[PDB]
CSV table of C-alpha atoms in Angstrom, one decimal:
chain,number,residue,atom,x,y,z
A,2,UNK,CA,2.2,16.4,7.7
A,3,UNK,CA,4.4,16.2,10.8
A,4,UNK,CA,3.8,13.6,13.4
A,5,UNK,CA,2.3,16.2,15.8
A,6,UNK,CA,0.0,17.4,13.1
A,7,UNK,CA,-1.2,13.8,12.5
A,8,UNK,CA,-1.6,13.2,16.2
A,9,UNK,CA,-3.7,16.4,16.5
A,10,UNK,CA,-5.9,15.5,13.5
A,11,UNK,CA,-6.5,11.9,14.7
A,12,UNK,CA,-7.3,13.1,18.3
A,13,UNK,CA,-9.7,15.7,17.0
A,14,UNK,CA,-11.4,13.2,14.6
A,15,UNK,CA,-11.6,10.4,17.3
A,16,UNK,CA,-13.1,12.9,19.8
A,17,UNK,CA,-15.8,14.2,17.4
A,18,UNK,CA,-16.8,10.7,16.3
A,19,UNK,CA,-16.3,8.6,19.5
A,20,UNK,CA,-14.6,5.9,17.4
A,21,UNK,CA,-11.0,4.9,16.3
A,22,UNK,CA,-9.3,7.4,14.0
A,23,UNK,CA,-6.4,6.0,12.1
A,24,UNK,CA,-3.7,7.1,9.6
A,25,UNK,CA,-0.8,5.5,7.9
A,26,UNK,CA,2.5,7.0,9.0
A,27,UNK,CA,4.8,7.5,6.0
A,28,UNK,CA,8.1,6.6,7.7
A,29,UNK,CA,11.0,6.9,5.3
A,30,UNK,CA,12.9,3.7,4.2
A,31,UNK,CA,10.3,1.1,5.2
A,32,UNK,CA,10.0,-1.3,2.3
A,33,UNK,CA,7.1,-3.6,3.2
A,34,UNK,CA,5.6,-3.1,6.7
A,35,UNK,CA,2.8,-0.5,6.9
A,36,UNK,CA,2.8,1.5,10.1
A,37,UNK,CA,-0.5,3.1,11.2
A,38,UNK,CA,-1.2,5.5,14.1
A,39,UNK,CA,-4.5,5.1,15.8
A,40,UNK,CA,-6.3,7.4,18.2
A,41,UNK,CA,-8.7,5.3,20.5
A,42,UNK,CA,-11.3,7.0,22.6
A,43,UNK,CA,-12.4,5.6,26.0
A,44,UNK,CA,-13.9,8.1,28.5
A,46,UNK,CA,-10.0,10.2,27.0
A,47,UNK,CA,-7.9,9.4,23.9
A,48,UNK,CA,-5.1,6.8,23.8
A,49,UNK,CA,-2.7,6.2,20.9
A,50,UNK,CA,-1.2,3.1,19.5
A,51,UNK,CA,0.9,2.1,16.6
A,52,UNK,CA,-0.1,-1.0,14.6
A,53,UNK,CA,1.8,-2.8,11.9
A,54,UNK,CA,0.2,-4.2,8.8
A,55,UNK,CA,1.0,-6.1,5.6
A,56,UNK,CA,0.3,-4.7,2.1
A,57,UNK,CA,-1.1,-8.1,0.9
A,58,UNK,CA,-3.5,-8.6,3.8
A,59,UNK,CA,-4.0,-5.2,5.2
A,60,UNK,CA,-6.9,-5.9,7.6
A,61,UNK,CA,-5.5,-9.2,8.9
A,62,UNK,CA,-2.7,-9.6,11.5
A,63,UNK,CA,0.7,-9.2,10.0
A,64,UNK,CA,2.8,-12.3,9.6
A,65,UNK,CA,6.4,-11.3,10.0
A,66,UNK,CA,9.2,-13.0,8.0
A,67,UNK,CA,13.0,-12.7,8.1
A,68,UNK,CA,12.9,-10.2,5.2
A,69,UNK,CA,11.1,-7.7,7.6
A,70,UNK,CA,14.2,-7.3,9.8
A,71,UNK,CA,15.3,-4.0,8.4
A,72,UNK,CA,11.8,-2.5,8.5
A,73,UNK,CA,11.5,-3.5,12.1
A,74,UNK,CA,14.8,-1.7,13.0
A,75,UNK,CA,13.6,1.4,11.2
A,76,UNK,CA,10.3,1.3,13.2
A,77,UNK,CA,12.4,1.0,16.4
A,78,UNK,CA,14.5,4.0,15.3
A,79,UNK,CA,11.4,6.1,14.6
A,80,UNK,CA,10.1,5.3,18.1
A,81,UNK,CA,13.4,6.4,19.7
A,82,UNK,CA,13.7,9.5,17.7
A,83,UNK,CA,10.2,10.7,18.8
A,84,UNK,CA,10.1,9.0,22.2
A,85,UNK,CA,10.6,12.1,24.3
A,86,UNK,CA,8.1,14.2,22.4
A,87,UNK,CA,5.5,11.4,22.4
A,88,UNK,CA,5.7,10.7,26.1
A,89,UNK,CA,5.1,14.4,26.9
A,90,UNK,CA,2.6,15.0,24.1
A,91,UNK,CA,0.3,12.0,24.2
A,92,UNK,CA,-0.8,8.9,26.2
A,93,UNK,CA,-0.7,5.4,24.9
A,94,UNK,CA,-3.0,2.4,25.3
A,95,UNK,CA,-1.9,0.7,28.6
B,2,UNK,CA,13.9,-26.5,22.3
B,3,UNK,CA,15.9,-25.2,19.3
B,4,UNK,CA,14.2,-23.2,16.6
B,5,UNK,CA,14.4,-26.2,14.2
B,6,UNK,CA,12.9,-28.4,16.8
B,7,UNK,CA,9.9,-26.0,17.3
B,8,UNK,CA,9.6,-25.7,13.6
B,9,UNK,CA,9.5,-29.5,13.2
B,10,UNK,CA,7.0,-29.9,16.0
B,11,UNK,CA,4.6,-27.2,14.7
B,12,UNK,CA,4.8,-28.5,11.1
B,13,UNK,CA,4.0,-32.1,12.3
B,14,UNK,CA,1.1,-30.9,14.5
B,15,UNK,CA,-0.4,-28.6,11.8
B,16,UNK,CA,-0.2,-31.4,9.3
B,17,UNK,CA,-1.9,-33.9,11.6
B,18,UNK,CA,-4.7,-31.5,12.5
B,19,UNK,CA,-5.2,-29.5,9.4
B,20,UNK,CA,-5.2,-26.3,11.5
B,21,UNK,CA,-2.8,-23.6,12.7
B,22,UNK,CA,-0.2,-24.9,15.2
B,23,UNK,CA,1.5,-22.1,17.3
B,24,UNK,CA,4.2,-21.7,19.9
B,25,UNK,CA,5.7,-18.9,21.7
B,26,UNK,CA,9.4,-18.3,20.8
B,27,UNK,CA,11.4,-17.6,23.9
B,28,UNK,CA,13.8,-15.1,22.4
B,29,UNK,CA,16.3,-13.8,25.0
B,30,UNK,CA,16.2,-10.2,26.2
B,31,UNK,CA,12.7,-9.3,25.0
B,32,UNK,CA,10.9,-7.4,27.8
B,33,UNK,CA,7.3,-7.0,26.7
B,34,UNK,CA,6.5,-8.2,23.1
B,35,UNK,CA,5.6,-11.8,22.8
B,36,UNK,CA,6.7,-13.6,19.7
B,37,UNK,CA,4.9,-16.6,18.4
B,38,UNK,CA,5.7,-18.9,15.5
B,39,UNK,CA,2.8,-20.3,13.6
B,40,UNK,CA,2.6,-23.2,11.1
B,41,UNK,CA,-0.4,-22.6,8.8
B,42,UNK,CA,-1.6,-25.4,6.5
B,43,UNK,CA,-3.0,-24.7,3.0
B,44,UNK,CA,-2.9,-27.6,0.5
B,46,UNK,CA,1.4,-27.3,2.2
B,47,UNK,CA,2.7,-25.7,5.4
B,48,UNK,CA,3.6,-22.0,5.7
B,49,UNK,CA,5.2,-20.3,8.6
B,50,UNK,CA,4.7,-16.8,10.1
B,51,UNK,CA,5.9,-14.9,13.1
B,52,UNK,CA,3.3,-12.9,14.9
B,53,UNK,CA,3.7,-10.4,17.8
B,54,UNK,CA,1.5,-10.0,20.8
B,55,UNK,CA,1.0,-8.1,24.0
B,56,UNK,CA,0.9,-9.7,27.5
B,57,UNK,CA,-2.1,-7.6,28.5
B,58,UNK,CA,-4.3,-8.3,25.4
B,59,UNK,CA,-2.8,-11.5,24.1
B,60,UNK,CA,-5.4,-12.4,21.5
B,61,UNK,CA,-5.9,-8.8,20.3
B,62,UNK,CA,-3.7,-7.0,17.8
B,63,UNK,CA,-0.6,-5.5,19.5
B,64,UNK,CA,-0.5,-1.7,20.0
B,65,UNK,CA,3.1,-0.7,19.8
B,66,UNK,CA,4.4,2.2,21.9
B,67,UNK,CA,7.8,3.9,22.1
B,68,UNK,CA,8.9,1.6,24.9
B,69,UNK,CA,8.9,-1.4,22.5
B,70,UNK,CA,11.8,0.0,20.4
B,71,UNK,CA,14.4,-2.3,22.0
B,72,UNK,CA,12.2,-5.4,21.7
B,73,UNK,CA,11.7,-4.6,18.1
B,74,UNK,CA,15.4,-4.4,17.4
B,75,UNK,CA,15.9,-7.7,19.2
B,76,UNK,CA,13.2,-9.3,17.0
B,77,UNK,CA,15.0,-7.9,13.9
B,78,UNK,CA,18.3,-9.4,15.2
B,79,UNK,CA,16.7,-12.8,15.8
B,80,UNK,CA,15.4,-12.8,12.2
B,81,UNK,CA,18.8,-11.9,10.8
B,82,UNK,CA,20.6,-14.5,12.9
B,83,UNK,CA,18.4,-17.3,11.6
B,84,UNK,CA,17.6,-15.9,8.1
B,85,UNK,CA,19.8,-18.2,6.1
B,86,UNK,CA,18.7,-21.3,7.9
B,87,UNK,CA,15.0,-20.3,7.7
B,88,UNK,CA,15.0,-19.5,4.1
B,89,UNK,CA,16.4,-23.0,3.3
B,90,UNK,CA,14.5,-24.9,5.9
B,91,UNK,CA,10.9,-23.5,5.6
B,92,UNK,CA,8.5,-21.5,3.5
B,93,UNK,CA,6.7,-18.4,4.8
B,94,UNK,CA,3.2,-17.1,4.2
B,95,UNK,CA,3.4,-15.0,1.0
């Protein structure tokens, strides 16, 4: 599944259910942080990326120094898809 | 306030109160993401860094492509202090 494909599936699902539709993005090279894409309905669908631990998935992530490389890789993912994303979808304000 | 100084103040406060003691870390160059250091008591004090939005401070942050640079700067902060931190404190597992 390409990013676009996941976007499209999560938008569809969120629209049909009128609730948050989420999916883990399998970004290469990330060791510990789990990245999840969410489609959030309002009126309208808005997207966000949330980060998560493995150990306490539903809780808020507690970052440690060992997450530095993961964080850079998330940053790089965002830049690589930035132009596409900003044309293709709208994010939570 | 140096990092060590904030660490020491948050450890002291968390120990005296038996509850989470938090403080925003004023890391230079970060535009939007708010970084907060937390001291969490168990038995023992464990530290975490959490990230936050300005707009929905208490909610979970929804990352967007515009946060890429902030994320890199957090990564760089973590690497710059990594050796000190891993000697000086213990993190949430």
